[PDB]
Write an enzyme that holds these catalytic residues in place. Structure first.
Site, mmCIF file in Angstrom:
data_model
loop_
_atom_site.group_PDB
_atom_site.id
_atom_site.type_symbol
_atom_site.label_atom_id
_atom_site.label_comp_id
_atom_site.label_asym_id
_atom_site.label_seq_id
_atom_site.Cartn_x
_atom_site.Cartn_y
_atom_site.Cartn_z
ATOM 1 C CG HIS A 1 -2.114 -0.931 1.053
ATOM 2 N ND1 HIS A 1 -2.903 -1.300 2.118
ATOM 3 C CD2 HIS A 1 -2.623 -1.564 -0.030
ATOM 4 C CE1 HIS A 1 -3.841 -2.133 1.703
ATOM 5 N NE2 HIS A 1 -3.694 -2.309 0.402
ATOM 6 C CE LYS B 1 -13.694 -4.571 -10.973
ATOM 7 N NZ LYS B 1 -14.611 -4.835 -12.112
ATOM 8 C CG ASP B 2 -13.187 -6.603 -4.436
ATOM 9 O OD1 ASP B 2 -12.999 -6.822 -5.651
ATOM 10 O OD2 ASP B 2 -12.358 -6.010 -3.717
ATOM 11 C CD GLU C 1 -2.854 -33.200 -3.178
ATOM 12 O OE1 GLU C 1 -2.739 -34.439 -3.276
ATOM 13 O OE2 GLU C 1 -2.169 -32.514 -2.392
ATOM 14 C CB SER D 1 -3.494 -1.451 -6.690
ATOM 15 O OG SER D 1 -3.773 -2.494 -7.606
#
Ligand SMILES: CCCCCCCCCCCCCCCCCC(=O)OC[C@H](COP(=O)([O-])OCC(O)COP(=O)([O-])OC[C@@H](COC(=O)CCCCCCCCCCCCCCCCC)OC(=O)CCCCCCCCCCCCCCCCC)OC(=O)CCCCCCCCCCCCCCCCC
Ligand SMILES: CCCCCCCCCCCCCCCCCC(=O)OC[C@H](COP(=O)([O-])OCC(O)COP(=O)([O-])OC[C@@H](COC(=O)CCCCCCCCCCCCCCCCC)OC(=O)CCCCCCCCCCCCCCCCC)OC(=O)CCCCCCCCCCCCCCCCC
Ligand SMILES: CCCCCCCCCCCCCCCCCC(=O)OC[C@H](COP(=O)([O-])OCC(O)COP(=O)([O-])OC[C@@H](COC(=O)CCCCCCCCCCCCCCCCC)OC(=O)CCCCCCCCCCCCCCCCC)OC(=O)CCCCCCCCCCCCCCCCC
Ligand SMILES: CCCCCCCCCCCCCCCCC[C@@H](O)O[C@H](CO[C@H](O)CCCCCCCCCCCCCCC)COP(=O)(O)OCC[N+](C)(C)C
Ligand SMILES: CCCCCCCC/C=C\CCCCCCCC(=O)OC[C@H](COP(=O)(O)OCCN)OC(=O)CCCCCCC/C=C\CCCCCCCC
Ligand SMILES: CCCCCCCC/C=C\CCCCCCCC(=O)OC[C@H](COP(=O)(O)OCCN)OC(=O)CCCCCCC/C=C\CCCCCCCC
Ligand code: HEC
Ligand code: HEM
Ligand code: HEM
Ligand code: HEM
Lengths: 106, 144, 49, 378, 81, 51, 49, 49, 62, 54, 54, 51
Positions: free
Chosen positions: D200, D226-227, D270, D204
């Site tokens: 931060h 949006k998230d 897996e 971003s």
């Protein structure tokens, strides 16, 4: 050092230039360059009107990216249209760094 | 398990609680296992206790052919065809292996309807909050 | 200058009810807001369930 | 004078969430990062309710899970949300790393490295957790993975027995793995806090790669919903994987009891580990396969050093973009090869795919980056 | 020290906007939205898909080759004798 | 990377050499003691409480 | 050496997304289990509940 | 003035025959533009109740 | 001129957020039951005769 | 809480999990604790403000 | 091992068969009581010196 | 404490009481719905999911 093959180089550079998408957003070539500290100081040295043109075109690009649209075809940047404004300044800055380094290694 | 092997030529009969989910192909593997018992192809032979079931990976299962017509009589009174029997067996094993099957299908139905309702609404809310940015204009006005 | 600026038309984006430059928006506003608040209100119901 | 600016807890929430500037033009891919932040919570909460019935003894670890899936009310949904939830966790993880590799987000080198360490942490967590159910593939996978440690030249077997707690995999190893599996994710959370901490102070990245200071916008109004939509779609895909086809991402054989004596055929780990496993299959040497394995994930750290282009995002550099999707296709190739028994066709394709996987990002990418530099006349 | 007042200097870039309530959530979808998504996908194609097609080719060839060697192995015993 | 080599950098690395071997001795002896490495500890004149 | 034959897919009644097990078949199948199966095979995890 | 917010301001109501404009008008230091808002609207809210 | 039903729904309720939360919770209060019996009626409709709750008649209550 | 009609194994497992998880919450709350502490400064035994001699 | 049967036996396993296990069990069990000594004194100084004003 | 007494405080509390009725109704109805209380819920015209 090729002649007509150099014109062929102009052709492939033009095609690759149209392959890059920044023309779709109106950006000049120099807007796209990554902004490390050398480029930062290079931008700091820009004349005010040019710096303003740069910041506005960057906003227009980000704004077009917002709505996922595209600049109209008439308005696209042309390969011969561009002015490579940032090069002399960035070259001065980088040359100064190389000078300070070559002095610094001695 | 030792006594089970001793009673069965050294073979150990698997627990059936997870036998459907354990094998590849699930219950589908079991029915096909209970059906196929072709006599061995010419040019191959096997231990007398062994039995030739092609679907078995060793292709020589120690199990004796468990079922045939009228081994059993259903209380329902339905005919005891070996195919019907094997189908009922694979069905019951399928339940024994997945008890929560029905409730899972129910919740699944509820969730699809639920999500089918929720997605357009929340996406519309996003379109609503973002519309001011999607629609906004901007211009450039140098003083000269 | 201080007067030369004017807002570019937004009629393409505007809701159908308020498109004209004549009718008062004061009555329509409860409907416009009411629709969206109804949407958020249903969504809150779903999330709560 | 808003109260957010006054109280320190409200200050930190005012920073990390409500007010911090973000580029406006951020797309759907960045959302995956936040999704990872969500997934961890699920993987805790859900998992927290599996630990209340699970018994880490070797003699009862399986029957306890039978107790969960059957006897416990609503236990099976927790079981499947947990198991599929790890898979969604690694899907969002791979997409996240691919996003960071594509848009030149690796230039934030400290954040990148914390991401790598956190990656290794999540990998170990998923491994020990997959060892917990104590099925066939679980027990066998543990034996196979653990032996690799034995590869190290001098210390080797003493160290391996130090992990086992004995000569062979058994109950103490299971209990230990239950403990580390219990403890690691919270460390992953603290790392995540470091991760966002380094992140931060710069802000971003945006898809164009150009600095977005001219068009920064508050996080709360927009990216929260949006998230919210991205989290809703995430829960949608997860619930669809759990309530309709719980099994297909999993592997039958785990429902059988572990046999120290008997050995299962296909012996496939897996799916998220599979590609790495192929590399072990690729190099005939033991220690060489181990080093190639460690290089398979470390290699990410070398990417910023290998960067040569004077731009971030690939989007303006189509050739490198094509190399990128070649790399993705290659990862699909390895990921598919990990599911297959050794045979003539597979062994050759696995080796070629691995060598291509190393050469494309240690050689071709920087060079074509230089070519892209010369094509644009600087 | 990167609060909104602390950010980059910039000069006369005027910007216009509207209230969300003043405008519908889905303007010009049929007329402008779909063609936009189409030009996007058309830009994405050749840069993305064909390499995946190469994955499909190597996949089918590998499956056909393994399945070929496996079932022709007894056939290899057949030409053997 | 090329810049790091030079007339004064040689001097600097040479200035820090004794410190480098000394801390190397620190890490080596520290490792030998922390691990109870048996091989070298068999050779040491007095530290032989090991049997 | 040669791999085992791959089982055919079947149109099972419950294979559908909303389809469910028919409990009568479970009943009759358990009736098969009680002696034809249970003479040697076991179900450790299933009860008379 | 408490932590020294607004430099200068006024409230206004420019009414017209058809509509009008209630509102406020204020000067700002660059760093305080948010805070000066948070009080203002709050005052409106304070009068709404 | 006449108020839209959305508006009468608005000013009577939505303008005050507490009433909005209240009508939300009451709406959940009805929607839970409605969605419940509805979806159950559907799932029952897909497979009549398969579910045991209707199979009970062949053997229940002596 | 019991998970049954009396204390038994499931309860012991409950307490094993909760007792395993709580301290790690206690650490985070302790970080909040210091977070509300350090913005004002530590107290001194006299009780008088001690900015003069920090 | 958190089960109604195996727990106590696992404790005997820790105290005996496990290497140095008893030292761990006692540093732990007494470490908790030390934690409450330090905690009660820690609250007590707050009650005394008026640190509660924070 | 003593300062809070005052006629404008009375006017203010009277201004904010209905909001307290609303949120109180919100918390009460919400609490009943969440726990599906049998005693309160049955009285309702339609909600009879409980048997
Ligand atoms: C109700 C209607 C359907 C709702 C669809 C919900 C899906 C939301 C979604 O996933 O999109 C990303 C959506 C972001 O939307 P957006 O980027 O703001 O939209 C751009 C703007 O609309 C501005 O960009 P735009 O101009 O492109 O917007 C137009 C587009 C919106 O642009 C998009 O981004 C596409 C997404 C919506 C359209 C997809 C159509 C599917 C049906 O929506 C349309 O109007 C297209 C119309 C096509 C109609 C279909 C043709 C036949 C009928 O939310 C997310 O970020 C979630 C993605 C991450 C999920 C995690 C994955 C789990 C693992
Ligand atoms: C593993 C699977 C994961 C799949 C992705 C999940 C999350 C995707 C996401 O970011 O949120 C939705 C996101 C919303 O658009 P966005 O926020 O502007 O994302 C940035 C664009 O990538 C910015 O790039 P763009 O503006 O040039 O548009 C990229 C995209 C254009 O796609 C869109 O405009 C948005 C979606 C509208 C189409 C929906 C089709 C019906 C559903 O072009 C493509 O569709 C990719 C080409 C190959 C697939 C063609 C058909 C797939 C549809 O849509 C996508 O990212 C594309 C989804 C691709 C589907 C998978 C195709 C298989 C390969
Ligand atoms: C879980 C624990 C929840 C509570 C977190 C407490 C830690 C926060 C903190 O230390 O504030 C520093 C703050 C002192 O710095 P400051 O000069 O007052 O400026 C405040 C800003 O942090 C000055 O820095 P800033 O202006 O750049 O503030 C922005 C930054 C502020 O973030 C932080 O201050 C640090 C938060 C993560 C700490 C690193 C974790 C290592 C493990 O926001 C972020 O980094 C994003 C949020 C990341 C944390 C998210 C946690 C939940 C998820 O508070 C203190 O006095 C430190 C003592 C607190 C406990 C520390 C002792 C044990 C560690
Ligand atoms: C897995 C980890 C993550 C958790 C999962 C999260 C899943 C959620 C995903 C779904 C998205 C939800 C977001 C949808 C929007 C939420 C609704 C919100 O916007 O309501 C706003 C305001 O919210 C409500 O008004 C207040 C609350 C009402 C409902 C309360 C129900 C009880 C919730 C209490 C929960 C407390 C947590 C502790 C548990 C008890 C409305 O604001 P706005 O539309 O702009 O303006 C309205 C103007 N009005 C109010 C005057 C009409
Ligand atoms: C303790 C704190 C935990 C907080 C967890 C909060 C998680 C909120 C996420 C919500 C996303 C869910 C989307 C849709 C889910 C859904 O509709 O499920 C309903 C449906 C109703 O089924 P019935 O039992 O038959 O009905 C009884 C009466 N209702 O329930 C289900 O079957 C699905 C259950 C899976 C839910 C998992 C959510 C966990 C996410 C966290
Ligand atoms: C392990 C993998 C196992 C998974 C099994 C199957 C997975 C298949 C993955 C294939 C998915 C690829 C489809 C993506 C579609 C797509 O990218 O469309 C093109 C689109 C065009 O973008 P723009 O340049 O912005 O266009 C400009 C126009 N305005 O390209 C993109 O945006 C994609 C960039 C985001 C990358 C996400 C890719 C997801 C996979 C990445 C993982 C690879 C890294 C692996 C490292 C892991 C190490 C631990
Ligand atoms: C005691 C006789 C016997 C009967 C009767 C019998 N089984 Fe088997 N079964 C065995 C033995 C022994 C094996 C192990 C075969 C082997 O190991 O090669 C086996 C194997 C199986 C397998 C496959 C396990 C594997 O590893 O592939 C299934 C499924 C199965 N039994 C279920 C059934 C079903 C369904 C029936 C139908 C009534 C049935 N059993 C009846 C003895 C029997
Ligand atoms: C990023 C975090 C996590 C991931 C990715 C993850 C992943 C997994 C995986 C893949 C499994 C294997 C289950 C299966 O395949 O059947 C598992 C099981 C398990 N997990 Fe997690 N896990 C995480 C965190 C946690 C946490 C925080 C807990 C806390 C209790 C937990 C508890 C368990 C338990 C007890 C099991 C075994 C029980 C069972 O499988 O029935 N996990 N987890
Ligand atoms: C559980 C795992 C992780 C979590 C919770 C997490 C968390 C976050 C969050 C919340 C962001 C904010 C921006 C966004 O969401 O896009 C972010 C960004 C970022 N993450 Fe992660 N992360 C995780 C794993 C990783 C990994 C594995 C890597 C790299 C290999 C990584 C590298 C980055 C980088 C480089 C950014 C910067 C984004 C930008 O520059 O725009 N993270 N992370
Ligand atoms: C795990 C439990 C706790 C931890 C880790 C912890 C930690 C700390 C630390 C390191 C300090 C710094 C000053 C000092 O060390 O004396 C402090 C201060 C303080 N703590 Fe605690 N504490 C805990 C429990 C408590 C409890 C139970 C109370 C009250 C009932 C409390 C109230 C206070 C107060 C009032 C101060 C202020 C002291 C001052 O200003 O000088 N704490 N705490």
């Amino acid at each position: 050092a090729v002649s007509a093959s150099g014109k062929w180089l102009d052709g492939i550079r033009k095609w690759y230039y149209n392959a890059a998408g920044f023309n779709k957003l109106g950006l000049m070539r120099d807007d796209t360059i990554y902004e490390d500290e050398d480029v930062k100081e290079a931008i700091r040295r820009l004349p005010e009107n040019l710096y303003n043109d740069r910041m506005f075109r960057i906003k227009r690009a980000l704004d077009l990216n917002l709505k996922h649209q595209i600049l109209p075809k008439e308005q696209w940047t042309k390969y011969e249209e561009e002015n490579f404004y940032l090069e002399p300044y960035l070259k001065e800055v980088i040359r100064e760094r190389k000078e300070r380094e070559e002095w610094a290694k001695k | 398990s030792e006594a089970a092997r001793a009673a069965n030529n050294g073979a150990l009969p698997p627990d059936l609680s997870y036998i459907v989910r354990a094998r590849h192909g699930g219950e589908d593997y079991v029915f096909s296992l209970l059906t196929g018992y072709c006599e061995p192809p010419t040019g191959v032979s096997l231990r007398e206790g062994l039995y030739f079931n092609p679907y078995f990976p060793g292709q020589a299962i120690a199990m004796a052919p468990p079922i045939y017509t009228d081994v059993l009589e259903f209380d329902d009174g339905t005919p005891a065809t070996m195919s019907q029997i094997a189908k009922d067996v694979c069905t019951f094993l399928r339940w024994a292996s997945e008890p929560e099957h029905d409730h899972r299908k129910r919740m699944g139905l509820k969730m699809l309807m639920m999500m089918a309702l929720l997605v357009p609404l929340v996406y519309t809310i996003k379109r609503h909050k973002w519309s001011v940015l999607k629609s906004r204009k901007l211009a450039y006005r140098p003083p000269k | 200058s201080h007067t030369d600026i004017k807002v570019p038309d937004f009629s393409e984006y505007r809701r159908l009810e308020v498109l004209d430059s004549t009718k008062s928006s004061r009555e329509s506003s409860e409907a416009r807001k009411g629709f969206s608040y109804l949407v958020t209100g249903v969504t809150t119901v779903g999330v709560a369930y | 004078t808003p109260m957010r600016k006054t109280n320190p807890l409200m200050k930190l929430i005012n920073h990390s969430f409500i007010d911090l500037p973000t580029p406006s033009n951020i797309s759907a891919w960045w959302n995956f990062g936040s999704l990872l932040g969500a997934c961890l919570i699920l993987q805790i909460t859900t998992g927290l309710f599996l630990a209340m019935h699970y018994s880490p003894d070797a003699s009862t670890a399986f029957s306890s899970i039978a107790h969960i899936t059957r006897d416990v009310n609503y236990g099976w949904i927790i079981r499947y949300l947990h198991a599929n939830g790890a898979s969604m966790f690694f899907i969002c993880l791979f997409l996240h790393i691919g996003r960071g590799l594509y848009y030149g987000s690796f230039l934030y080198s400290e954040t990148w490295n914390i991401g790598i360490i956190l990656l290794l942490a999540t990998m170990a967590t998923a491994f020990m957790g997959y060892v917990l159910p104590w099925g066939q593939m679980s027990f066998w996978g543990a034996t196979v993975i653990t032996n690799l440690l034995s590869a190290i030249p001098y210390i080797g077997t003493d160290l391996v027995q130090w992990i086992w707690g004995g000569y062979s995999v058994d109950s103490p190893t299971l209990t230990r793995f239950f403990t580390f599996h219990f403890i690691l994710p919270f460390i992953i959370a603290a790392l995540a806090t470091l991760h966002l901490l380094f992140l931060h102070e710069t802000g971003s990245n945006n898809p164009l790669g150009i600095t977005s200071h001219s068009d920064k916008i508050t996080f709360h109004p927009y990216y929260t919903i949006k998230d919210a939509l991205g989290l809703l779609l995430f829960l949608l895909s997860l619930m669809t994987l759990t309530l309709f086809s719980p099994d297909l991402l999993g592997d039958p054989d785990n429902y059988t009891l572990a046999n120290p004596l008997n050995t299962p055929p296909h012996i496939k780990p897996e799916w998220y580990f599979l590609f790495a496993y192929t590399i072990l299959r690729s190099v005939p040497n033991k220690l060489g396969g181990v080093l190639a394995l460690l290089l398979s994930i470390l290699i990410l750290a070398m990417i910023p050093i290998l960067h040569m282009s004077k731009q971030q995002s690939m989007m303006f550099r189509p050739l490198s973009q094509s190399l990128y999707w070649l790399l993705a296709a290659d990862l699909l190739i390895l990921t598919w090869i990990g599911g297959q028994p050794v045979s003539y066709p597979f062994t050759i394709i696995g080796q070629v795919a691995s060598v291509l996987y190393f050469t494309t990002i240690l050689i071709l990418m920087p060079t074509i980056s230089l070519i892209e530099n010369k094509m644009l006349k600087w | 020290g990167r609060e909104f007042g602390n950010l980059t200097r910039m000069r006369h870039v005027i910007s216009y906007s509207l209230s969300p309530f003043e405008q519908r959530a889905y303007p010009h979808v049929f007329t402008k939205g779909i063609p936009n998504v189409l030009r996007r996908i058309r830009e994405s194609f050749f840069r993305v898909v064909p390499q995946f097609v190469v994955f499909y080719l190597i996949y089918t060839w590998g499956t056909e080759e393994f399945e070929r060697s496996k079932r022709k192995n007894p056939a290899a015993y057949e030409n053997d004798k | 990377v090329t810049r790091f080599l030079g007339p004064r950098y040689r001097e600097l690395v040479k200035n820090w050499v004794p410190t480098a071997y000394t801390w190397g001795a620190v890490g080596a002896v520290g490792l030998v003691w922390a691990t109870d490495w048996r091989l070298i500890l068999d050779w040491v004149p007095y530290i032989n409480g090991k049997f | 050496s040669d791999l085992e034959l791959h089982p055919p897919s079947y149109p099972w009644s419950h294979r559908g997304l909303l389809s469910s097990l028919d409990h009568t078949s479970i009943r009759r199948g358990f009736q098969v289990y009680k002696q034809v199966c249970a003479s040697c095979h076991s179900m450790d995890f299933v009860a008379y509940r | 003035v408490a932590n020294k917010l607004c430099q200068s301001f006024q409230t206004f109501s420019i009414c017209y025959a058809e509509t009008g404009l209630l509102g406020a008008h204020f000067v700002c230091d660059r760093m305080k533009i948010d805070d000066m808002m948070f009080v203002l609207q709050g005052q409106w809210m304070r009068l709404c109740t | 001129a006449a108020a839209t039903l959305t508006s009468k729904l608005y000013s009577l309720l939505f303008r005050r957020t507490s009433t909005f939360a209240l009508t939300i919770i009451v709406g959940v209060m009805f929607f839970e039951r409605a969605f419940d019996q509805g979806a159950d009626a559907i799932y029952d409709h897909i497979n009549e005769g398969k579910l045991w709750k209707h199979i009970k008649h062949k053997y229940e209550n002596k």
